């Protein structure tokens, strides 16, 4: 069953991976309404597609800046992977294209805003609430890892809540297709596995570590390793000593000791039973994995939605006009985009 599902999913992925889609829309098909988020190379805007009237999130990246910052591979990875995957808790790329100056990735608009804002607003999530989202991530990494994909940037800021209270994973900026070890120092300091920080070379297990950090943060309201600066954080991480809030259940603590495990021969997700170690853990005993996959479980939280184009679930950012040069820039670097 899951075996069967995963093998067909891999055929589907490989077809698209091998022959990615390209140039399916163009800038003037969309009216830009508001910035939803920014980044190193550009920004993410709420846009409206003129002919359908549907709203989308348009991720905009300055080609020149991408080359300068040595992020070509990561950016090509992001698009190539996002266009080939398909899973209920992954955001959908609807269109992509490029112009003289920029790269564009147009995704389904997920209006519920980031998990991050809801988490900080409410303080922390109850274990059933945290457990509902964690199951989604477990299934998602099982899918991704089966395609040889490492996600590498799990955090509440990259998880969006949809109109049904379900998670949409966004930001494939550090996602990578690889069998074996890889070495890039990337992610978010609070979430880095010890093996990333010690520059040992690492594999998919870092995603499972990050899950433990995420479950901790959701349940505690704060991360297991925090400080004012990255350096300090890496010290606590490699220390590995973790303390748990008084309200954590015994099962939760046991699960987290297994995920936040410095020893890779012992970290859950990484053993002989693989993910099943996680799925069959006591803390997940009330979880209906199929129902979750099917999105038939009632969500604990359903974002308020003041209609199409509503961005009240997002913070406001300062806007700036999108420049497109009359000169093509970096054409060769981004030929495959």
């Amino acid at each position: 069953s899951v075996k069967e599902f995963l093998a067909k999913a891999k055929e589907d992925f490989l077809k698209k991976w091998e022959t990615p889609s390209q140039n399916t829309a163009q800038l003037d098909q969309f009216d830009r309404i508001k910035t939803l988020g920014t980044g190193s190379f550009g920004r993410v805007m709420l846009v409206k597609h003129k002919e359908s009237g549907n709203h989308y999130a348009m991720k905009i990246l300055d080609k020149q800046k991408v080359v300068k910052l040595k992020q070509i591979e990561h950016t090509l990875n992001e698009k190539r992977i996002l266009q080939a995957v398909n899973f209920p808790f992954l955001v959908k790329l609807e269109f992509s294209f490029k112009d003289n100056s920029n790269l564009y990735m147009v995704m389904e608009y997920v209006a519920g805003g980031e998990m991050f804002s809801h988490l900080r607003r409410i303080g922390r999530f109850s274990e059933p609430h945290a457990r509902f989202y964690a199951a989604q991530i477990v299934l998602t990494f099982e899918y991704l890892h089966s395609l040889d994909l490492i996600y590498r940037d799990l955090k509440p800021e990259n998880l969006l809540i949809d109109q049904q209270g379900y998670i949409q994973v966004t930001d494939f900026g550090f996602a990578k297709r690889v069998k074996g070890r890889t070495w890039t120092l990337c992610g978010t300091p609070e979430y880095l596995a010890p093996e990333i920080i010690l520059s040992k070379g690492y594999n998919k297990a870092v995603d499972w570590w990050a899950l433990g950090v995420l479950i901790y943060e959701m349940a505690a309201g704060y991360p297991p390793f925090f400080a004012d600066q990255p350096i300090q954080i890496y010290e606590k991480i490699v220390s590995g000593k973790v303390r748990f809030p008084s309200h954590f259940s015994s099962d939760l603590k046991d699960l987290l000791r297994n995920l936040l495990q410095v020893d890779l021969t012992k970290r859950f997700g990484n053993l002989k039973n693989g993910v099943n170690d996680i799925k069959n853990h006591k803390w997940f005993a009330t979880t209906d994995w199929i129902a979750i996959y099917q999105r038939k479980v009632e969500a604990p939280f359903i974002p308020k939605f003041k209609g199409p184009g509503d961005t009240s679930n997002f913070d406001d950012y300062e806007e700036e006009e999108i420049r497109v040069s009359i000169n093509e820039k970096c054409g060769k670097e981004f030929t495959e985009f």
Partner: peptide, 20 residues
């Protein structure tokens, strides 16, 4: 408390990704 110390810290807002 741990919460009070976290909440008083400089990293309670959106966290930026880092790379090589």
């Amino acid at each position: 408390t741990t919460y009070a110390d976290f909440i008083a810290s400089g990293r309670t807002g959106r966290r930026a990704s880092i790379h090589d």
